[PDB]
Amino acid sequence: KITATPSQFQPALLNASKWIWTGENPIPGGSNIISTRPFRKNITAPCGKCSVCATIVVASDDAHTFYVNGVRIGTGAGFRQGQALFVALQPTWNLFAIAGQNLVANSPAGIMASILVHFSDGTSETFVTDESWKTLRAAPPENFQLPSTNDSNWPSAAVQGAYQNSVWGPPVLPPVLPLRGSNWIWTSDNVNGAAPVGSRAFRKTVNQCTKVAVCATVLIAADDRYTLYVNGATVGSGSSYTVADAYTIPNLHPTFNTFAINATNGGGPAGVIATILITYSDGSNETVVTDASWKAIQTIPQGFQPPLIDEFGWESAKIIGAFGVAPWGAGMVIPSA
Ligand SMILES: *[C@@H]1O[C@H](CO)[C@@H](O[C@@H]2O[C@H](CO)[C@@H](O)[C@H](O)[C@H]2NC(C)=O)[C@H](O)[C@H]1NC(C)=O
Ligand SMILES: *[C@@H]1O[C@H](CO)[C@@H](O[C@@H]2O[C@H](CO)[C@@H](O)[C@H](O)[C@H]2NC(C)=O)[C@H](O)[C@H]1NC(C)=O
Ligand SMILES: *[C@@H]1O[C@H](CO)[C@@H](O[C@H]2O[C@H](CO)[C@@H](O)[C@H](O)[C@H]2NC(C)=O)[C@H](O)[C@H]1NC(C)=O
Ligand SMILES: CC(=O)N[C@@H]1[C@@H](O)[C@@H](O)[C@@H](CO)O[C@H]1O
Ligand SMILES: [Ca+2]
Ligand SMILES: [Ca+2]
């Protein structure tokens, strides 16, 4: 039962996290052979809380594959900048599994992750890579990542370093979501680099009726200002085209969700841009971006935000340009994952 409601996005940080490997070299940050190694941690929800979903940041020397409850969530590489991943969880326990690879001979090896778990009651807790994870001093077995594998006789992971004290130094958090990939959109009265003064509304429905949607993360900005709605409820508003806002929607409807925006032009150029990631209970996700599949209208009707209104006389939104175009450029300040 989910009493959490939409909120400002809360970043997962690496500050409390540790680098782990096998300890085949007992020197932390020491030379390691070219190898692939498994890591697993079964994490349980505290007393009378349900886990709903997680924000994950993972970094690796040299590369990783990340699994949750046996499902591949992502693949990445590199220790200078973390990789953001989002995943729906089982309510009481979750098996996290990572395959790490050292790709350069005589070089250090390590995995670091932070898992920020959101609970049904609106609280959060961060879990990290540390010596409580299990590993093997050998290539991962077939199906090492499945919950049905017994890791009772596996050794403990060896700590290679901490966030602020390691051969790697502190990895930079990635942006919560990319804007690269999204489009500034408006109504088709936006012509020759300017649009009229006024408010315009935009709508996007997601409806995968054979899946169960769990959480959304939304990244949004507008020239000049916006208010954002999900299934008719207020998520938030902003007034900056240089600093983007991020939100968590921890209580999605399971099959049908409507995002609606009232965006206002104070003068000159205008646009709204957003990226939305939706997590599903099977471990999959989908990304939605501002594009021409959104609907837009120039005079905002009463109830423009309700999920099931008649969209008759809404137009296809106009693409003003991909993220990066003048006048706004590529410099948007995006919150950290
Ligand atoms: C959402 O899930 C997808 C599918 O499981 C992940 O990716 C595909 O996944 C990899 C791993 O990062 C991407 O690099 C690929 O590019 C995708 N397929 C392609 C290009 O052919 C993705 O990591 C997930 N996003 C999350 C969990 O945040
Ligand atoms: C992760 O730990 C949980 C909690 O300890 C395990 O689930 C318990 O598993 C026992 C043994 O099957 C069950 O009989 C209990 O009913 C479960 N407790 C709860 C709170 O669900 C779980 O099996 C572990 N998962 C893996 C992959 O090892
Ligand atoms: C869309 O958003 C705009 C901007 O928030 C809303 O605008 C105005 O709302 C009131 C009139 O109802 C004024 O007293 C406000 O001061 C005014 N603010 C601005 C910046 O214009 C607009 O009403 C919104 N809602 C709809 C449904 O349009
Ligand atoms: C008064 C006016 O037009 N201000 C606009 C501002 O809203 C924004 O659109 C900016 C984009 O670069 O151009 C500015 O000149
Ligand atoms: Ca290495
Ligand atoms: Ca403007």
Side-chain angles (χ1 to χ4, degrees):
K1 169 55 162 175
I2 296 166
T3 64
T5 59
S7 59
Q8 178 179 317
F9 173 75
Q10 185 197 341
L13 310 169
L14 292 174
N15 290 68
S17 180
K18 283 119 177 53
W19 297 98
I20 64 179
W21 195 246
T22 64
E24 284 157 293
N25 184 342
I27 300 168
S31 62
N32 286 89
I33 65 170
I34 293 173
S35 47
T36 305
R37 301 288 185 255
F39 306 86
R40 291 176 45 120
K41 183 71 210 270
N42 179 10
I43 290 173
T44 64
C47 25
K49 278 188 204 307
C50 284
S51 42
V52 177
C53 58
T55 300
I56 298 169
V57 179
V58 54
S60 60
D61 179 347
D62 290 276
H64 63 267
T65 308
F66 204 109
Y67 303 88
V68 180
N69 295 319
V71 180
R72 200 197 60 80
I73 292 318
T75 302
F79 59 86
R80 296 262 183 233
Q81 190 187 239
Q83 178 182 50
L85 300 172
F86 302 92
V87 73
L89 293 182
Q90 299 164 351
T92 63
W93 64 265
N94 291 287
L95 195 267
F96 300 94
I98 308 169
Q101 306 165 45
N102 191 27
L103 293 176
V104 177
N106 305 313
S107 76
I111 298 300
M112 170 180 270
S114 162
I115 310 166
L116 177 60
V117 173
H118 308 284
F119 297 109
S120 46
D121 66 5
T123 64
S124 276
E125 179 178 346
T126 301
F127 303 86
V128 296
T129 42
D130 64 24
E131 64 280 2
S132 77
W133 286 52
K134 296 321 204 63
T135 191
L136 291 174
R137 298 174 153 235
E142 209 52 71
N143 298 340
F144 87 89
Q145 80 270 23
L146 297 180
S148 68
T149 302
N150 197 345
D151 67 16
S152 270
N153 272 167
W154 284 36
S156 281
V159 170
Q160 299 298 299
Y163 173 79
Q164 215 46 277
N165 183 27
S166 75
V167 291
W168 294 291
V172 174
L173 293 176
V176 60
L177 293 166
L179 288 180
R180 174 190 185 97
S182 311
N183 304 274
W184 294 95
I185 64 171
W186 207 250
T187 43
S188 61
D189 59 341
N190 191 323
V191 291
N192 308 116
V197 176
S199 290
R200 309 286 186 274
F202 307 84
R203 289 180 106 260
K204 179 72 182 184
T205 300
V206 177
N207 178 213
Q208 300 289 343
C209 60
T210 68
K211 294 177 104 171
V212 175
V214 181
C215 298
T217 310
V218 180
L219 179 64
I220 180 164
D223 181 348
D224 272 292
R225 68 193 329 109
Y226 69 88
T227 306
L228 171 64
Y229 299 90
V230 183
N231 300 329
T234 307
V235 175
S237 64
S239 51
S240 174
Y241 54 86
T242 59
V243 178
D245 304 315
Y247 304 94
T248 290
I249 302 153
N251 56 341
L252 287 176
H253 185 281
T255 58
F256 189 105
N257 290 281
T258 293
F259 305 88
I261 304 167
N262 172 9
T264 303
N265 188 24
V272 62
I273 189 169
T275 307
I276 302 164
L277 195 151
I278 289 154
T279 52
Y280 291 106
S281 63
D282 69 351
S284 67
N285 63 72
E286 91 176 82
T287 294
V288 169
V289 300
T290 43
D291 64 18
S293 79
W294 288 55
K295 263 67 180 304
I297 194 162
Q298 307 184 15
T299 306
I300 300 177
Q302 271 329 78
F304 70 92
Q305 84 274 25
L308 297 181
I309 61 168
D310 191 1
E311 286 179 348
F312 183 81
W314 292 61
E315 61 181 333
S316 281
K318 185 180 173 183
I319 286 165
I320 308 316
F323 180 59
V325 291
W328 310 284
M332 193 70 65
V333 176
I334 297 171
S336 300

